[PDB]
Amino acid sequence: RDQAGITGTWYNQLGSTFIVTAGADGALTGTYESAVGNAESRYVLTGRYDSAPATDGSGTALGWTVAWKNNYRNAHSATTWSGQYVGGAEARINTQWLLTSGTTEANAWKSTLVGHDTFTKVK
């Protein structure tokens, strides 16, 4: 359906790079590279998407997770993106995300950042 649509390389407004493969069973697998934060190189990501979306012009729901540990760095944090893929000439993934840091119980109240990223197939 959108499996072909989704699979490939995406960029967000920060210059981060998202490389993903969409499986026929709804799986998402790939790597993420962040242009910001104390992140370097590629980090693993896994997620899911609606492999049988509605056919009424709705987007396709999806989400994925990155834990910010790889062989170079550990930020002791994880981001999840939740959003929808929108096909067409200017195909986009529109997301909102939550970034939770490991914290003490005392600092739990400020453990979580929220934002929005838009991914396109170019730049």
Strand 43-49, strand 27-33: pairing: antiparallel
d(CA 27, CA 86): 18
- The answer to the question of residue 115 lying near a copy of itself (CB under 8 A) is yes
Strand 60-69, strand 43-49: pairing: antiparallel
- The answer to the question of residue 58 lying near a copy of itself (CB under 8 A) is yes
The residue within the footprint of a copy of itself, chosen from 56, 89, 122, 123 (CB under 8 A), is: 56
Q: How far is the CB of 118 from a copy of itself (least distance, A)?
A: 10
Q: What are the C-alpha distances in Å from 24 to residues 51, 52, 90? A: 7, 10, 23
- Residue with structure tokens 């390389």? 9
CB atoms within 10 A of CB 87: 16
> How many residues sit in the footprint of a copy of itself (CB under 8 A)?
65
- The answer to the question of residue 6 lying near a copy of itself (CB under 8 A) is no
- The answer to the question of residue 71 lying near a copy of itself (CB under 8 A) is no
Q: Is 72 annotated as a binding residue?
A: no
Instruction: Answer yes or no: are the C-beta atoms of 6 and 24 closer than 8 Å.
Output: no
- The answer to the question of residue 20 lying near a copy of itself (CB under 8 A) is no
d(CA 116, CA 63): 13
- The answer to the question of residue 21 lying near a copy of itself (CB under 8 A) is no
- The answer to the question of residue 102 lying near a copy of itself (CB under 8 A) is yes
Q: Site residues (CB under 8 A) for a copy of itself?
A: 14, 25-28, 36-37, 44-54, 56-69, 74, 76-84, 86, 94-106, 108-116
